[PDB]
Design a protein around this ligand. Structure first.
Ligand SMILES: Nc1ncnc2c1ncn2[C@@H]1O[C@H](COP(=O)(O)OP(=O)(O)O)[C@@H](O)[C@H]1O
Ligand SMILES: Nc1ncnc2c1ncn2[C@@H]1O[C@H](COP(=O)(O)OP(=O)(O)O)[C@@H](O)[C@H]1O
Ligand SMILES: Nc1ncnc2c1ncn2[C@@H]1O[C@H](COP(=O)(O)OP(=O)(O)O)[C@@H](O)[C@H]1O
Lengths: 85, 603, 49, 14, 48, 331, 48
């Protein structure tokens, strides 16, 4: 029943390492984030951040194998750079 | 089966009492070393194991798979009788072996080789990121409560979890996040080393798998060695094919051997310091800076200077000026102008080669680009961002499309690249020293006309470059002698510091020391500027400006770094002033001959 | 040359702009030593800071 | 302000 | 460093820094959802 | 065994060089320059060492230039005809890769299978391209990447790669107006970009001008060709044997330790001085890369004559060769 | 200084609105430090 049910929000940020360093040879790797409720919209893309979170795992669908599971970071919580702007 | 319950014992004897080279057990030392280093990876020479008992080695040949499962357990209990508390951490030590020719290069392998241990060589190509692997698998079930406990699976199966715990159904099994432990995993596409190719056949991709401590150790653009177990696995359905039945092959890698990581160290630095004390070390270094070119004393001097450093140096709290030396190396067809900068890519810590454009990746302009195959959009820097704090190396400015030109200009100007597309909006920070190779318009020396007239690059972009190295000349008898002997000497083949200690020297000094001038006696410089300025206005335009003063100071303190001097001295000034002043001289039109006569007191 | 006429073929730019400052550098040993010495002060010993 | 902008006019003249 | 993450960090608090490429359209999840059986006409609730 | 006797018979004689030269391209009439120009590609330098380090070149390059109707193409067709491991394209239609690999994806079942193709499928050999002037910018750069870095790096939307091609490139390039322009600098005439220009040593320009003796000889020779009789015109070497001969001559590792190499220096030295003033001469420079060129030329002639450690004389031959290649640029 | 502080801004009817604040040209040969000066303004100004 959708009338009496209460819902919340979820973002899916995606974090890349600073493009500066230090791949030097390669396309720099990134991790996927999930933010619930009050951690949403705190961050504009481009803003340098430092996340405290819980490293973790989901199965998804192989783009892989065998038994490989792609990592992601559940975020609690986020302390931005100040400001930076 | 349990036959091997004999075997494991023997080889651990081979572990523990084995002594060689004046006794002094090597493997006991091996274990005791790791050890507190706690590297959980044990490495065994195949020569030793072949020597003591051959059937061991041959059972490494036939089926190494379960063999290593025999080996590692008892390796562990041995480690435990060595360390009582080690059973608690890492729980397992699996072994890398060492040396087993073969040496199947890459291309030649057949089904006779699969499942059997095989060593392979080849160049690392682009490789996937790091992923977790299940290791100990555990199931919370559903109706039958918990925890059902850890199981071992697998490489690579992870199945089938048939029947357990009440039931076994229908409240059947779902893996959980907690109390399941994972191990790192990576794929490396390894292709045949392009050097040894027989003519006409193409080097063949073959896929490598890395686990545990092996992960991320290898870097692309390096010929790597792996000692693996060649397998035809998997997935494996591949019920798609059908005809003919065909299984893919995968080298599963046990080990990695580098081609065939540098840092300063206490003994090496305490040794080191005594070398930097002599004054002539500078000249020695310059002479060491570009060995195979035979070069010039000047054009190498610039290189050394800019490569070696400067001081940033932020004025509280506003502007940092610039702490780098941008070398415009203005070449000439047939002059070494390319090769020199190539040296810099080998020696320097962080050094990047962007070529002109077209391109040899990276391509000099930060842009957010859709990824290969199907992937999310990753941000990427140009050469500039990538090379930050390091040395950016560009050649043939003249061939660059304006789209890049603006990027370089911006980078030099504000020391940062700003990117506004697509939704991503930032300023990345590239502090790079730019070293450039440029090609004069048309001929070797296009005109008596000034440098700015000599070459296409506009004057304002050029003004950003402090040091201009012009190369010449008209045919000289002796110079052609001297050169030709050197070149011929090179092709026929078929005092300066060792390259390694200099390429450490530079990094060392850049990290540790920050030289500084003292206000008291250096007022002289001001006078010098005047002495240069006015008298230079009578002939030639402009180029001189207070910028061109500042470069004096900065270059000087670079030399102060080579001296490891901690402060600026008059010698350093002498060196610098000679550098910048001769730079300015050599840019001007032939009327600059008239200039030369006042250079004497500056000399 | 005429003060305008600088930007492209058109002065209209300069018309839109309110405050236009032509800056000149001429060499005067007094002033040149002033500016120079000032910069020597700027780099370090940070005495200016 | 008048004189400041006057300096600007002096800049317009040269 | 984002480059370095061991598999021993799984389900443990890990802190790291980087630059966000992209953030995504908001989605909605249910913390409290009252449910009903269609035939049984029974009513319940699940609160996550 | 039975043939090696013939091979010996070839190396013994003092004329077999001249026999080679005259016997190369029967169809073509004279010019004597581009004969040597063609053969000396088949027989390449040491292309090895000097380490630590970067490796020397090695191989060779030529670009034939001239007013059309000069049958510059007949050479080409003769090379694709004669020597194995030779690809012929007419590019402008290269179109792109073409001279490089696709790479082929998918397969299926993992893909990363590589197309041959064009340039690279001819490896350690002579690739022949007509009309550099028609292929514009895009591919020429790729060719430069082939003749500079010596390697072909390939990454497309998928598996990154590096594939070696070590090759000689024979091109035929028509002038801006299809003519000379004798008075113009060759630098300005050929109309290809500088970096690829400086890697081709050397050009062997031909222009045809009317001389009634030669004219009569042409008409005679051509009508001869279109006559089934007499087709009796024959080279001193048969097209079949010249291959086994060459392949034999390829197995040599000519190396000059000889200190007569000192002489070469003055020769290099003799070359630039007279060519320094005026600058309005054919320069060039003469670039050190030409000193570097004299080497591979020397070793080429060593390959030719089976002689090891060569002679200062052969050096002088390569030398004069380069000289006329220069003077043709003078006017 | 007089630039950063903005100026008279007028929304007066009709829809025409006069603006602030002005413009500044630093044009001249190098050694003017103008290109550095701009970095400074960039620092000071609240949003720049
Ligand atoms: N004096 C010399 N000694 C040794 N090698 C030289 C000398 N002069 C030039 N070279 C070689 O010739 C090459 C010239 O290439 P270069 O003209 O620098 O390339 P580009 O014209 O594309 O910038 C260089 O790679 C260099 O190695
Ligand atoms: N010396 C020669 N030997 C053989 N054929 C020649 C010679 N000179 C001219 N020809 C004739 O000229 C034609 C080739 O023209 P060509 O010079 O190749 O034109 P393009 O320069 O456009 O390639 C051939 O058909 C050939 O019959
Ligand atoms: N009055 C000044 N005080 C301090 N530094 C100055 C002054 N005038 C010029 N400079 C120097 O000039 C440089 C700025 O150059 P600039 O004139 O902005 O170049 P451009 O005008 O071509 O942009 C700075 O390095 C700065 O050190």
């Amino acid at each position: 029943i959708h009338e009496s049910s209460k819902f919340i929000d979820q973002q899916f940020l995606k974090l890349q390492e600073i493009p500066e360093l230090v791949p030097v040879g390669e396309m720099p790797r990134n991790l996927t984030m999930t933010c619930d409720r009050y951690l949403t919209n705190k961050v504009i893309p481009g803003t340098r951040v430092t996340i405290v979170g819980i490293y973790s795992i989901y199965n998804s669908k192989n783009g892989s194998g065998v038994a490989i599971r792609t990592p992601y970071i559940k975020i609690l919580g986020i302390q931005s750079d100040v400001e930076t702007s | 089966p349990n036959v091997s319950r004999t075997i494991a014992r023997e080889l651990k004897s081979f572990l523990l009492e084995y002594t060689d080279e004046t006794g002094r057990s090597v493997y006991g030392a091996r274990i005791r070393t790791l050890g507190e280093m706690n590297s959980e990876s044990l490495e065994v020479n195949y020569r030793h194991l072949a020597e003591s008992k051959a059937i061991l080695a041959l059972f490494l040949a036939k089926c190494p798979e379960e063999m290593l499962k025999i080996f590692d357990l008892v390796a562990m209990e041995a480690t435990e009788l060595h360390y009582p508390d080690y059973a608690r951490i890492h729980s397992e030590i699996h072994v890398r072996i060492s040396d087993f020719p073969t040496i199947y290069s890459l291309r030649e392998l057949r089904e006779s080789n699969l499942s059997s241990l095989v060593r392979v060589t080849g160049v690392v190509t682009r490789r996937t990121g790091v992923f977790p692997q299940l290791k100990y698998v555990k199931f919370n079930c559903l109706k039958c409560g918990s925890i059902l406990g850890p199981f071992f699976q697998d490489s690579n199966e992870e199945i089938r979890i048939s029947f357990c715990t009440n039931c076994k159904s229908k409240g059947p099994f779902r893996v959980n996040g907690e109390k399941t432990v994972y191990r790192n995993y990576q794929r490396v596409t390894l292709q045949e080393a392009p050097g040894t190719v027989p003519p006409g056949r193409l080097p063949r991709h073959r896929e490598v798998i890395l686990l545990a401590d092996l992960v991320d150790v290898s870097k692309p653009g390096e010929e790597v060695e792996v000692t693996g177990i060649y397998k035809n696995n998997y997935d494996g359905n591949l019920n798609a094919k059908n005809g003919f039945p065909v299984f893919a092959t995968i080298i599963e890698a046990n080990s990695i051997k580098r081609r065939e990581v540098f840092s300063w160290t206490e003994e090496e630095e305490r040794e080191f310091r005594k070398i930097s004390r002599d004054r002539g070390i500078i000249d020695k270094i310059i002479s060491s800076m570009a060995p195979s070119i035979y070069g010039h004393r000047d054009i190498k001097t610039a290189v050394a200077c800019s490569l070696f450093g400067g001081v940033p140096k932020n004025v509280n709290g506003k502007h940092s000026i610039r702490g780098d030396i941008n070398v415009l190396l203005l070449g000439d067809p047939g002059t070494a102008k390319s090769q020199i900068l190539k040296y810099v890519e080998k020696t320097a810590h962080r050094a990047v080669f962007a070529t002109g454009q077209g391109a040899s990746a990276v391509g000099l302009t930060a842009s957010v680009r859709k990824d290969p195959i199907t992937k999310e959009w990753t941000l990427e820097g140009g050469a500039l961002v990538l090379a930050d704090k390091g040395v950016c190396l560009i050649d043939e400015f003249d061939k660059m499309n304006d789209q890049d030109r603006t990027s370089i200009h911006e980078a030099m100007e504000q020391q940062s690249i700003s990117i506004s597309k697509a939704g991503i909006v930032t300023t990345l920070q590239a502090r790079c020293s730019i070293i450039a190779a440029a090609n004069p318009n048309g001929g070797r020396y296009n005109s008596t006309l000034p440098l700015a007239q000599n070459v296409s690059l506009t004057e304002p972009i050029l003004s950003r470059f402090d040091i201009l190295c012009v190369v010449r000349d008209l045919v000289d008898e002796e110079a052609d002698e001297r050169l030709a002997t050197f070149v011929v000497d090179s092709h026929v083949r078929s005092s300066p510091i060792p390259q390694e200690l200099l390429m450490k020297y530079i990094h060392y000094a850049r990290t540790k020391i920050y030289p500084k001038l003292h206000q008291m006696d250096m007022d002289k410089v001001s006078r010098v500027y005047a002495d240069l300025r006015r008298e230079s206005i009578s002939t030639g335009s402009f180029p001189i400006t207070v910028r061109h003063l500042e470069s004096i100071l900065r270059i000087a303190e670079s030399f102060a770094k080579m001296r490891l001097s901690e402060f600026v001295s008059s010698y350093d000034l002498d060196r610098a002033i000679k550098v910048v002043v001769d730079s300015f001289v050599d840019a001007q039109k032939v009327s600059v001959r008239r200039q030369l006569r006042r250079s004497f007191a500056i000399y | 040359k005429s003060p305008g006429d600088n930007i492209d073929f058109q002065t209209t730019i300069l018309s839109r702009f309110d405050m236009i400052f032509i800056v000149k550098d001429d060499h005067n040993e007094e002033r040149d030593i002033s500016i120079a010495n000032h910069v020597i002060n700027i780099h370090t010993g940070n005495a200016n800071a | 302000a008048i004189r400041l902008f006057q300096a600007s006019t002096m800049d317009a003249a040269s | 460093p984002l480059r370095d993450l061991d598999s021993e960090h799984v389900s443990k608090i890990v802190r790291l820094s980087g630059i966000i490429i992209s953030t995504s359209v908001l989605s909605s999840r249910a913390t409290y959802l009252s449910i009903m059986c269609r035939n049984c006409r029974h009513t319940t609730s699940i609160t996550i | 065994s039975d043939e090696i006797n013939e091979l010996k018979e070839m190396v013994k004689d003092e004329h077999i060089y001249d026999k080679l030269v005259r016997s190369i391209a029967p169809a073509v009439f004279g010019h004597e320059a581009v004969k040597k120009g063609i053969l000396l590609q088949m027989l390449g330098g040491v292309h090895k060492s000097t380490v630590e380090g970067i490796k020397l070149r090695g191989d060779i390059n030529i670009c034939v230039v001239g007013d059309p109707s000069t049958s510059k193409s007949q050479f080409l067709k003769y090379v694709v005809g004669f020597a194995p491991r030779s690809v012929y394209t007419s590019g402008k239609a290269s179109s792109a890769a073409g001279l490089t690999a696709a790479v082929v994806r998918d397969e299926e079942g993992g893909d990363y299978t590589i197309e041959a193709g064009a340039l690279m499928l001819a490896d350690n050999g002579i690739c022949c391209i007509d009309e550099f002037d028609k292929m514009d910018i895009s591919d020429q750069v790729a060719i430069h990447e082939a003749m500079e870095q010596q390697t072909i790096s390939i990454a497309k939307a998928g598996i990154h790669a590096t594939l070696n091609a070590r090759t000689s490139i024979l091109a035929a390039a028509n002038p801006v107006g299809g003519r000379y322009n004798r008075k113009l600098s060759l630098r300005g005439n050929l109309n290809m970009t500088a970096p690829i220009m400086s890697r081709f040593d050397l050009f062997f320009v031909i222009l045809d001008d009317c001389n009634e003796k030669i004219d009569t000889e042409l008409a005679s020779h051509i009508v001869d060709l279109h006559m089934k009789r007499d087709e009796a015109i024959e080279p001193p070497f048969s097209a079949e044997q010249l291959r086994r001969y060459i392949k034999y001559a390829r197995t040599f590792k000519p190396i000059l330790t000889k200190e007569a190499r000192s002489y070469l220096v003055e020769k290099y030295k003799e070359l630039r001085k007279d060519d320094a003033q005026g600058f309005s001469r054919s320069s060039y420079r003469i670039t050190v890369r030409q000193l570097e060129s004299m080497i591979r030329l020397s070793e080429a002639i060593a390959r030719a004559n089976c002689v090891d450690e060569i002679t200062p004389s052969f050096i002088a031959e390569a030398y004069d060769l380069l000289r006329q290649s220069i003077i043709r640029v003078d006017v | 200084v007089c630039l950063l502080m903005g100026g008279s801004k007028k929304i007066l009817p009709d829809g025409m609105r006069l603006r602030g604040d002005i413009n500044v040209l630093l044009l001249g040969d190098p050694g003017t430090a103008k290109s550095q000066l701009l970095k400074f303004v960039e620092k000071v100004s609240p949003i720049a």
